[PDB]
Amino acid sequence: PRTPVLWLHGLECTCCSESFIRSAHPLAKDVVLSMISLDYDDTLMAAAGHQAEAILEEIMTKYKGNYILAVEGNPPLNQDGMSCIIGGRPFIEQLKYVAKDAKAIISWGSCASWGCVQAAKPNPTQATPVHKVITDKPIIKVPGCPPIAEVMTGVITYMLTFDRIPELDRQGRPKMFYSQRIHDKCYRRPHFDAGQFVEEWDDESARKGFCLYKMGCKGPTTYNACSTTRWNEGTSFPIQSGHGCIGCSEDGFWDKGSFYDRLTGISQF
Amino acid sequence: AYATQGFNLDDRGRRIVVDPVTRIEGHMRCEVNVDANNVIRNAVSTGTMWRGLEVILKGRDPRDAWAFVERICGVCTGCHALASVRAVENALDIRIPKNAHLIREIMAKTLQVHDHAVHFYHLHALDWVDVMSALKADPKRTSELQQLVSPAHPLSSAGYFRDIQNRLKRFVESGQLGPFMNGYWGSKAYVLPPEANLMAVTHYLEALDLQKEWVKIHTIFGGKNPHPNYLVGGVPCAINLDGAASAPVNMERLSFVKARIDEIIEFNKNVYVPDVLAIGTLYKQAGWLYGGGLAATNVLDYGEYPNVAYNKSTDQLPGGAILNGNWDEVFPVDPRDSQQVQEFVSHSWYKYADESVGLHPWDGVTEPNYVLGANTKGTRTRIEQIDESAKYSWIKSPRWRGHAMEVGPLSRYILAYAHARSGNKYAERPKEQLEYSAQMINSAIPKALGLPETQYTLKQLLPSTIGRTLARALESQYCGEMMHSDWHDLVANIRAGDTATANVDKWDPATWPLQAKGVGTVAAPRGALGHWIRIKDGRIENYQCVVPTTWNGSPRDYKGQIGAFEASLMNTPMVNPEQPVEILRTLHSFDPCLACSTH
Ligand code: SF4
Ligand code: F3S
Ligand SMILES: [Cl-]
Ligand SMILES: [Cl-]
Ligand SMILES: [Cl-]
Ligand SMILES: [Mg+2]
């Protein structure tokens, strides 16, 4: 029997769900048909309304302490929680109910991990990451807006193969994917090291793939697998396609100044 | 009970609640009332989420805005970034170079295809296709059906369909049905024969594997999908063919993009369009022409994809507004005119000083006001029956000159048809697609399946849930064809010696006017998208989005007029009022994006 996954959605944009289905190794199709049992997921499930909600009860009973809760998005605490309503009730009530019997909780993306765009100042809904609401369960954070597809499926694959959460760093991220800063193995690093920088978009330096630090690249302070694993079956990543990293896997990246303002103290990096 | 727009709304019948509405993006609640014969006589659209992007943007740098608003939605990923950079460029009088225009168009058309095809197979298909019936199908008959429906699709053997069927059987026999759990399988609302169901399920799996290839076009130009990067003044993906392996775009990368476009063209022509024509034919034969709603009267789009950049008369999806079902008169739509696009909050969880008026988005206001009406069943945090006489949604109510309009691919195809009939040559292809489609649905497919031939006009077929589904598929095909041409134009321009990708003359805010306003519009996958920005002293003063699902999913306005979702559900019989099959089928035909609608 395949491990049940109950995939909940709070306040979100659905990028993490979309990223998940881009996975090439493994295929999302094979994950859903042969690895997990994806029993609740608003995006894809046949049942709606009362029939959808009845599934949660059934799975939690039959697989108590042996299903994975995956959360995309986050709960709002303002508007009495009713800036995110599910079954006429605040999302936070669904989150807490499903979390109580989960064997593990995956916080998909920056929304669930940290807050992401809705939590940027002034956070009108008091959107709050999962780990500040659920404080008594094992959580793995898989940050990024969205995370890389193979990072998402890589996490699931590890958890299913070993029945364990992989080793986490201090911030609760899997070391197998978040141990390196983008800047460590970025292919433009030799340019950074030689002081070779883009200064204006589409300047000669940009046409030669010079480093994007002076255009605001946050690669030096951002942990993710983008420089090595890369995106969409290793086709590109933001820097390869010519835009600086905006820091999208890091806590609070929307409120660290303009994306185009350079990091200070270049000698640090 | 009251009458509006030719609909007799009546809330005295049995109340039915669907919360959550699933197989959409984001969060929606729907309530209906049905009469003694299970016919919907009232419908209520409630957007059940809000994040407040418009509020978050205040005080930030206009150059950063695209990335914030891109995160309105990961399904229609990038269309908000495009609207934003367009709005900023319009405010600051920035003209982007030709290559940036073409690359953005290619990205936009890639999104259209990906969004439309994934919507249809992975979100919509299960409203038309009974997956349990597919298990009863005969593989040889399925092979024969495939050869009739789409002769050129090479995945047609009986052994192939048998292999797919056996995998589905094993999945179902496991007792862990996953996304098929507690479905409405076996409802009389499903009319397809087993072979059609197996064919469609097969294509659901094919589309799931192929969709990840299509988005690699975004990855090349924008670094990643979802959420590719954009840029005020152009694109970041600088071009270098020789000087070059280190540049974002070289000839090898462009060749890769073309290979992906060619695959898209094959998928739309051989899989998606034929499936929708076939399924549409069979549901037409069953008499299921419900769901027209406002499409029968009032449709709107801003118009998009000019053959010549910055020249709107050359739009290949020409826009405007049609009222009262008069397809002989397309009114021009101006996003700058304060008397045209306006948003009401009379029945929305927001506050204006005066809620009897609608605000043009340059004067828009987003102040939350979550409060429930006196006739609510339940409490503030435990709603049993929402009170649609008061405020009942996080979605604002956009109107055009006070009129409630439907937006989306169907709207664009009705507008294109009207334009083509008035002599607009730029709309010839969508007109051709429609005429071909009507002939397939009325005659060719029925003749091939041994069914009676019918004589529905486009006036009759298009304003329906079937028509709405068809227009989306045709639009996908047209978008694939257009970006094929855009690719050739891009490569030709680069080879002629124009490698420019960004205009940086006004990148630095020290060059900006001290105040400015701008608007960016996009023919987004679900309809008419606009972003309206006011800039002051280098910062965002106001930023208002009016998004396609805002139009379609809107609650009632000050005058009590209903929006497209509510109108579309009206007057539809349900086989079983406790199984929302018909509600889901029609709502899904709009491809609701609730995060978009509320932002
Ligand atoms: S600053 Fe950015 S572009 Fe430059 S080497 Fe570091 S990660 Fe790469
Ligand atoms: S913006 Fe995000 S996708 Fe990677 S390159 Fe930077 S962490
Ligand atoms: Cl964050
Ligand atoms: Cl406001
Ligand atoms: Cl007829
Ligand atoms: Mg808005």
Curated annotation (Swiss-Prot), chain A:
Any binding details for the cofactor? Binds 2 [4Fe-4S] clusters.
Q: Which cofactor(s) are needed, names only?
A: [4Fe-4S] cluster; [3Fe-4S] cluster
Its membrane topology is listed as:
Peripheral membrane protein
Annotated residues that bind [4Fe-4S] cluster 2 are located at H183, C186, C211, C217
Name one process (GO BP) from the record. anaerobic respiration
Cell compartment(s), UniProt: Cell membrane
Q: Which family does it belong to?
A: Belongs to the [NiFe]/[NiFeSe] hydrogenase small subunit family.
Q: What is this protein called?
A: Uptake hydrogenase small subunit
Give the species: Cupriavidus necator (strain ATCC 17699 / DSM 428 / KCTC 22496 / NCIMB 10442 / H16 / Stanier 337) (Ralstonia eutropha)
**Residues of the whole record sequence present:** 48 to 316 of 360
Curated annotation (Swiss-Prot), chain B:
- List, separated by semicolons, the cofactors it needs: Ni(2+)
Known catalytic reactions: H2 + A = AH2
Note how many cofactor molecules are bound and how. Binds 1 nickel ion per subunit.
Task: Kindly state one GO CC term assigned in the UniProt record.
Answer: plasma membrane
Q: Does the keyword Oxidoreductase apply?
A: yes
What is the annotated localization of this protein? Cell membrane
Q: Name one Pfam family in it.
A: NiFeSe_Hases
Please report which protein family the annotation says this sequence is part of: Belongs to the [NiFe]/[NiFeSe] hydrogenase large subunit family.
Name assigned to this protein: Uptake hydrogenase large subunit
Q: Which organism is it from?
A: Cupriavidus necator (strain ATCC 17699 / DSM 428 / KCTC 22496 / NCIMB 10442 / H16 / Stanier 337)
Q: What is the lineage of its organism?
A: Bacteria, Pseudomonadati, Pseudomonadota, Betaproteobacteria, Burkholderiales
Q: Which gene encodes it?
A: hoxG
